[PDB]
C-alpha cells in the first residue's frame, strides 16, 4: 500500500521549543547566541527573535540542519566571529558556518557527550573535554594526536591559561591536576574536594573553585608546593557556577540557593549594599552566568526552560536589576511548560495544545491567541466539531468552556467530579459527551446554545448511567479510555479488570467483554469499517480483536517501554504507535507488518494524533512541541645490510672529508629482532645465513660491548646465537687470512668473559655470604 | 590520604630526576613494580668500573643509595627481601635481586641488628635458586674461551 511520512530530518516540524538553556555565548556584542534545544539568536538587550538555527534546508545539503535536538551542552562563538561550534548530547562535535548554516567538519572520537568545549586564545586550537573522562585537543586540520591527557575517572572542569604552554586542570572526581604542556606529566595533584567540581573561574590571578563542599578555595597562578591563601565557607548550599566581570573589577558567584553575590573591596569579602535591587535573583536554580557585552547588565541562564537578563548594583553599571526580557518566541516557550493533551478540529486550522497555565491556538506553525484558566495540565482536550468552542479537562476534575475568539472563559462546566478526568470524547454531531471518571458511573452531557431553561452552554446533567460494581481483584471502578461508535450505535469503555465491555446507546445490555490482559489497558479505538478493534495495554503488547473471545489472533509484541497511544487511521488503514522509548511506528491496518519506523524523537512523546486530512502529524511531547510529518632470516639480512649500511656511513663521516630501523642507534633493532623471535625453531632461520652475515654480524656485538648495554639484550642470548653460528660456519673454513674482524673477536670475547665474570663473582660471594649467618642463627 | 596521593605524584615526578629519594620514597610507598623499574634502569646496563657497593655509579651519582641502605631499618630490608624472593624465580631478574644482597651484606652486622623478624623461610628459600643460576654461568664461562682457543 501507500503510507505518509518520510525518512527526512524535517517535514515542516515545529518540534524545537527553543528551551531548557544551560549555557550561552556572546557574539557581536549587541547580540547574544543561546544554547537551547537549537541554536538561537537573541538581542542582548531587547529580547526579540533575531534569527534561529535549527533543522531545515541548508544551502547545498539535504538531511542537514543548523542545529539538532537532544539538548546542546555548550555554545560559544569564535573571537573573530567567523566560526560556529556546538557540542551536543552525542559525542560528535559540529562546527557550522557563521553567515550560512552549512557544516564545515564533523568531530568524533568521543565515547560520550561533551562536558567541556571552548575556543582557545589562539583560535587554531579548540579544546573539548567529554564525559568519557579525558581531554581532546583540536586543530583546524583536525589534529587529535597532539595531546590526549587522561588519568581521570570522572569528567573535567577547569582549564586554559593564555600562554600556549603550562596548562591547568580541575576535575569532577574531586581532583585538581597539574600538567605541563611540553611532555605532560602529573607533577602535582591538589585535592580539596570529595565530590563534583560544579563550576570554575579564574578572576585574573586567583583561581577559585566551586564544588559540593559549599566552600570556595582560592589558588595562586605561579604555583608549586600548593599556594593556599584562604577559603570562603558556607554560602548555604553547594555552589554551581561563577563569573568574572569583563572589566575584571568584580566577581559574581551563583549557587543553587537562588542567590548571586559578587566580591569587592574584587576582594575576599562582599562589601557593597544589595538592597538596591528590585528584580530578585531567581525562581529556579540557574545553570551558568555570563556578564553582558554591553558592560551594564548581567546575563543569567536558568533551569526554568528559559534564560533571563538582570544587572548588578554598581555605579558604572545599573545600580539595580531590571525586569527580565524574553525573546520573540512563536508562543511555544513564551508560555510555561509541557503538553499532556492535544485536540483536533475538522477544519485543519484549529489545533490546540495545553500546558500547566496555557492553551495555545495553532493553524500549522502560526499562533493566534492564548487562553489561560488552567489549574493544572490537561489529561484530555476536545474541540467542538466545527471548531466553535473548546472543552477542557484539567487535573481537578473540571471541564472548561472556551471561546475561539478571545482568552476569556465563557462558562465553567459543572464540577460534579471529585477526581481528574482521564478520558473524554464527543459524538458525531457533538451533542453527547462521555467522560473519564472514578465516580463509578458514566456521565452523559447535553450541548446546545443558550436559549432555553436547560443550559447546553453549561451542560446540565439529566441522565444517570450507573451499574459499575463489577467485582475483581485488580481494580473495580476506574476508566482510562472511552470510544464512541462511528455508526453511533454503542459505547466502548476501558476497565481496570483487564476487560472491555460493549453496550449500546440506551439502557444496559451486554455485547462483548475482552480479557486476557496481563496488564491493564491504556487506549482502545475503533476502525471506521467497524468490524475489528485494537487495544493497547501496559504489557508492551498490542492486541487485535474482531468478534471472538479467547482465540488469539496475534500478540503484537515488539516493544521495550510503556505504550502511550496507538490509534487507527482516519480512513482506517494505518494504525500507529507512540510510546515511552521516543519512537513512533507505522503499522498497516490490513497486515501485521510495519511500513515505516519513524525515529527522530529524542524526548518523550506523551500523545500523538493525526487529523482527518492525514497530511500531517500532531504530537504531544515532553519538550512541549510537535513534529509534523508527511621469512625472518631474510628480514635479518635486511637488518644487517641496513645496519652495516649505517655504521660504514658513520665511520667516514668527517674523519675523512634512512629514518627507521629503530633507534638513535640502528643496532638496537638488531637485538630487537632477537627479542621478537620465538625461542623455538630460530636455528632454522639462522642456518640459512652465509659467512658474510657473520662478518656483518659481529660488528654489532662489538657495538653493544663498546656500548656497555645489557638493557635490551642479555649475554646468554648473544652467546646463544654465537654458539649457534660457530656450530654452523666457521672461523678457518670461512677465512684463512688474518683480517680486522678476526682480530676484533679476540678482544670482544675478552670483554664478554670479563663482563660475565663480574656477575659470576658477585653471586660467588653472595651465596657464601648468605650461608654464614645461617650457620649462627640456630 | 591526601599526602599519600600527592606523595605518589611526587613519586611520579622524581623518577624523571634522580634515583635515591625515589628509591627510599618508593620504598615507603606502593608499588614495588615501579621500584623494579628504577632498579632496572639504574642497575640495568653493563658496568664494572670504579668503586661501588651495589653497582650503582653513573655519570649522575648513584652512590648515595650506597649510603641509603646503611641507614635503612630492618622492616624495609625484609620487605625488600620478599621482593627479591619474588624476583629470583624467573630468569634474568634474579641478578637484579642479587644487586642489593652484596650491598646489604656489607652494611649490617652478623646479628641483622638484634631486633630481627622471623625470616628463616626466606633465607632458606634464596639459596637453591642461586646454585641453580650459578651452574648456568659456569657453563657459559667454560664455553666462552673455546672459540678463542682454536686458531
Curated annotation (Swiss-Prot), chain A:
One GO term describing the cellular component: nucleolus
GO process terms (BP): endonucleolytic cleavage in 5'-ETS of tricistronic rRNA transcript (SSU-rRNA, 5.8S rRNA, LSU-rRNA); endonucleolytic cleavage in ITS1 to separate SSU-rRNA from 5.8S rRNA and LSU-rRNA from tricistronic rRNA transcript (SSU-rRNA, 5.8S rRNA, LSU-rRNA); endonucleolytic cleavage to generate mature 5'-end of SSU-rRNA from (SSU-rRNA, 5.8S rRNA, LSU-rRNA); maturation of SSU-rRNA; maturation of SSU-rRNA from tricistronic rRNA transcript (SSU-rRNA, 5.8S rRNA, LSU-rRNA)
Keyword field contains Ligase: no
Entry-linked InterPro entries: G-protein_beta_WD-40_rep, SSU_processome_Utp12, TBC1_cilium_biogenesis, WD40/YVTN_repeat-like_dom_sf, WD40_repeat_CS, WD40_repeat_dom_sf, WD40_rpt
Annotated compartments: Nucleus, Nucleolus
Keywords on record: Nucleus, Repeat, Ribonucleoprotein, Ribosome biogenesis, rRNA processing, WD repeat
SUPFAM superfamilies with a match to the protein in the record: Nucleoporin domain, WD40 repeat-like
SMART domains registered for this protein in UniProt: WD40 (SM00320)
WD repeats: 67-97, 109-139, 151-180, 192-220, 334-363, 373-403, 416-446, 516-546, 558-588, 600-630
Superkingdom, natural source: Eukaryota
Further information: Present with 9620 molecules/cell in log phase SD medium.
Function: Involved in nucleolar processing of pre-18S ribosomal RNA.
Subunit-level organization: Interacts with snoRNA U3. Interacts with MPP10. Component of the ribosomal small subunit (SSU) processome composed of at least 40 protein subunits and snoRNA U3.
Similarity section: Belongs to the WD repeat WDR3/UTP12 family.
Protein name, as recorded: U3 small nucleolar RNA-associated protein 12
Species of the source: Saccharomyces cerevisiae (strain ATCC 204508 / S288c)
Biological classification of the source: Eukaryota, Fungi, Dikarya, Ascomycota, Saccharomycotina
Curated annotation (Swiss-Prot), chain B:
Subcellular location: Nucleus, Nucleolus
WD repeat placement: 5-46
Signal peptide residue numbers: none
Further facts: Present with 8070 molecules/cell in log phase SD medium.
Record function comment: Involved in nucleolar processing of pre-18S ribosomal RNA.
Complex and partners: Interacts with snoRNA U3. Interacts with MPP10. Component of the ribosomal small subunit (SSU) processome composed of at least 40 protein subunits and snoRNA U3.
Identification of the protein by name: U3 small nucleolar RNA-associated protein 13
Organism: Saccharomyces cerevisiae (strain ATCC 204508 / S288c) (Baker's yeast)
Residues of the full protein shown: 660 to 810 of 817
